[PDB]
From TrEMBL, chain E:
The gene is PSMC6. ATP 2 binds at residues 39-44. GO terms for cellular component: cytoplasm; nucleus; proteasome complex. Transmembrane segments: none annotated. ATP 5 binds at residues 39, 41-43. This is 26S proteasome regulatory subunit 10B. It comes from Homo sapiens.
Length: 106, 304, 69, 49, 100, 69
């Protein structure tokens, strides 16, 4: 939330533009904990922030953290589930869920 | 009261509140002035400021002895403060506090609707030890059997009372239409938008009642039978069992490729085997008390 | 951080100040403005008092008799 | 205070997660252990020339 | 008349309302310094604060705790709180803070 | 039998759930100095094998000094 509070500050308005708007929608996606919204914001702004001057490595750490933070919350009701429903609750494809879950047991 | 109150006159009184406290609070009239501004704060829809200036009141109590219609009737605006978010158990504690004066003021319509308003939503509080003994206090009343909602508090005792939500709907056609005075049921549930939040909450409280009794009396239960025993969909049943188990308030664990869920405790080797010795020790001890007793009755009658 | 400020009044206008402050007196500033809103019956700091709490604790020049500089 | 050189030179390798001790580790440790009184303002010195 | 009340709500409002001390968050308001003459002020307007609840009083002579090694004195702190734990805000009356 | 001793006369031992009242990340930005005190006290107490790996004989005492506050 303080990300928007900085860029609304009077010194940051001098240097406003595209890349500050890139981190705003990333802030809103991390605020809502919406997974594909982060993926959409990464996809919409390529040369801004999927390049890695020194931030896209750190964004991959925050995104790979956000998977199991969303994934641990949706296991507790069951002992046993089929994986197309857990792809439906996460609103994502199932193949990357398989490679992520297989990393979690290993 | 020149322009009969607005945002400005609420600001005009909040800036001049404590100047009397700065002169000398009057056991009564100072309390009567320092209460009056927060209903103006409710007119400006201010709630956090309202309870701060309401907490000054609490030490000046027991002046309703000399007060006929003012002391415990301003607190009907204090439940409007706690009307806001969820605090249902606290304003049923409140209704028992304002229960007394219309029994001093021996009325049979204002006091009867005090019984009506308190018996409606002790139910709507979430289940606790505080709800469990409060209903054990307010039951057994000599006055509660004037109203057919004595049946309802009996119906929410325990062990399901063989219930069904559609039968609860057919017990409650009267809450809008007829009754002796009927007015708090229209006030609580018959309202449009505040009733409808309480409509979904009363549906929420009865399905919460039905989960606990299923955990008492079932090893397993299928998915289709739980949905028809809760009068709603299978997916809305999945949502209700999800946010209760992550609330860790009902122990359950489902299996939704086949739909069979269970309410079993997590099995362990020694505790199951700790049970066989316990049944055994109770068995061997009881036959000793049995044989000791039949030896006596043999001994008495043989002598006659 | 462990204080509900909740305004749009920026604190860094007091970072960039001279009149170097000892670390114990920073603790005095944030607690004084806590008093200088609650005593006036505010459930939140409005940070118009924060100027006055800053100017209060900074005045430790005492007397010095206007003598020997 | 030769020990103080020996401890602080080996301390430089500890913060580097290293066991190797070079001659550069000692020469930085000489200036750390050895100090002075640092008599300031010089007016005391030149009152007493 | 000015000092009956200037001391009143600087004690009353923090003890009656600790919830505002989380609406911004500081626990800290620990009382005023009554200094001046001996007169009747030290003993009599302490009973003016006794007008609502108050009561407690007890007594602080400012001498039985001032023993030199403070390993005993810290126990002599909590010895007086053996009755101050028995209530709500107990009001430790304290005479001759600075007098030996 | 021998009773459990007490050694209980002049007790200043901040222990028995009474010591802390603070976490380690409460201090704002003494990062050269939070790292330095930790090397002499907290580090040889737990990871004593690192000093024996070199033969350091970890240091005994630390003198802090500065303005009051
Ligand atoms: N860098 C700092 N970070 C957080 N709090 C500080 C800092 N410096 C001072 N304080 C606060 O100021 C007070 C100074 O206390 P203390 O350390 O006893 O003073 P001194 O530095 O003279 O020993 C502490 O209670 C502390 O809460």
């Amino acid at each position: 939330e303080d990300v928007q509070a900085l860029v609304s500050g009077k010194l940051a308005l001098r240097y406003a533009g595209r890349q500050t708007e890139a981190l705003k929608c990333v802030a809103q996606a991390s605020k809502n904990r919406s997974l594909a919204d982060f993926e959409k914001a990464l996809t919409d702004y390529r040369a801004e922030l999927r390049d890695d001057p020194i931030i896209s490595t750190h964004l991959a750490k925050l995104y790979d953290n956000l998977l199991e933070q969303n994934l641990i919350r949706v296991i507790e009701p069951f002992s046993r589930v089929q994986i197309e429903h857990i792809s439906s609750l996460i609103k994502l494809s199932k193949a990357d869920v398989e490679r992520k879950l297989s990393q979690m047991i290993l | 009261k020149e322009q009969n109150g607005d945002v400005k006159e609420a600001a005009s009184i909040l800036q001049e509140l404590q100047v009397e406290t700065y002169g000398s609070m009057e056991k009564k009239e100072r309390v009567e002035f320092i209460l009056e501004q927060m209903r103006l704060c409710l007119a400006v829809k201010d709630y956090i400021r309202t309870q701060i200036i309401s907490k000054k009141i609490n030490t000046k109590f027991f002046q309703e002895e000399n007060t006929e219609k003012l002391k415990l009737k301003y607190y009907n605006l204090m439940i409007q403060l706690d009307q806001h978010e969820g605090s249902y158990l606290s304003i049923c504690k409140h209704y028992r506090a304002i229960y007394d004066t219309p029994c001093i003021q021996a009325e049979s319509e204002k006091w009867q609707q005090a019984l009506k308003s308190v018996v409606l939503y002790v139910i709507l509080a979430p289940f606790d030890n505080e709800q469990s003994d409060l209903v054990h206090r307010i039951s057994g009343d000599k006055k509660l059997e004037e109203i057919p909602k004595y049946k309802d508090l009996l119906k929410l005792f325990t062990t399901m009372e063989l219930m069904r939500w559609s039968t609860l709907v057919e017990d409650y056609g009267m809450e809008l239409r007829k009754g002796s005075l009927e007015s708090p049921a229209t006030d609580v549930f018959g309202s449009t938008e505040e009733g409808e939040k309480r409509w979904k909450d009363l549906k929420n409280r009865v399905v919460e009642h039905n989960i606990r009794i299923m955990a008492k009396y079932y090893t397993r239960i299928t998915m289709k039978r739980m949905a028809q025993l809760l009068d709603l969909s299978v997916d809305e049943s999945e949502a209700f069992l999800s946010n209760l188990v992550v609330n860790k308030t009902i122990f359950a664990k489902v299996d939704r490729l086949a739909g069979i869920i269970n309410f079993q405790r997590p099995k362990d080797p020694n505790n199951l085997l700790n049970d066989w010795s316990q049944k055994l020790n109770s068995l061997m001890s009881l036959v000793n008390k049995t044989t000791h007793l039949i030896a006596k009755e043999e001994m008495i009658h043989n002598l006659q | 951080s462990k204080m509900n400020l909740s305004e749009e009044v920026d604190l860094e206008d007091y970072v960039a100040r001279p009149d170097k402050i000892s670390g114990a007196d920073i603790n005095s500033i944030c607690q004084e403005s806590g008093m200088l809103a609650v005593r006036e019956n505010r459930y939140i700091v409005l940070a118009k008092d924060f100027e006055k709490a800053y100017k209060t604790v900074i005045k430790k020049d005492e007397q010095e008799h206007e003598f020997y500089k | 205070e030769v020990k103080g050189v020996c401890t602080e030179a080996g301390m430089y390798a500890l913060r580097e997660r290293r066991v190797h001790v070079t001659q550069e580790d000692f020469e930085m440790a000489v200036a750390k252990v050895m100090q002075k009184d640092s008599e300031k303002n010089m007016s005391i010195k030149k009152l007493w020339k | 008349s000015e000092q009956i009340r200037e001391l009143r709500e600087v004690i009353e409002l923090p003890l009656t309302n600790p919830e505002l001390f989380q609406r911004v968050g500081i626990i800290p308001p620990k009382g005023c310094l009554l200094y001046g003459p001996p007169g009747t002020g030290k003993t009599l307007l302490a009973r003016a604060v006794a007008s609502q609840l108050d009561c407690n009083f007890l007594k602080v002579v400012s001498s039985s705790i001032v023993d030199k090694y403070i390993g005993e004195s810290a126990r002599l702190i909590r010895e007086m709180f053996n009755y101050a734990r028995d209530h709500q805000p107990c009001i430790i009356f304290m005479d001759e803070i600075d007098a030996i | 039998d021998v009773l459990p001793p007490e050694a209980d006369s002049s007790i200043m031992m901040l222990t028995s759930d009474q010591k802390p009242d603070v976490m380690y990340a409460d201090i704002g930005g003494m990062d050269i100095q939070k790292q330095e005190v930790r090397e002499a006290v907290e580090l040889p107490l737990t990871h004593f094998e690192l000093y024996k790996q070199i033969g350091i004989d970890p240091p005994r005492g630390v003198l802090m000094y500065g303005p009051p506050g």
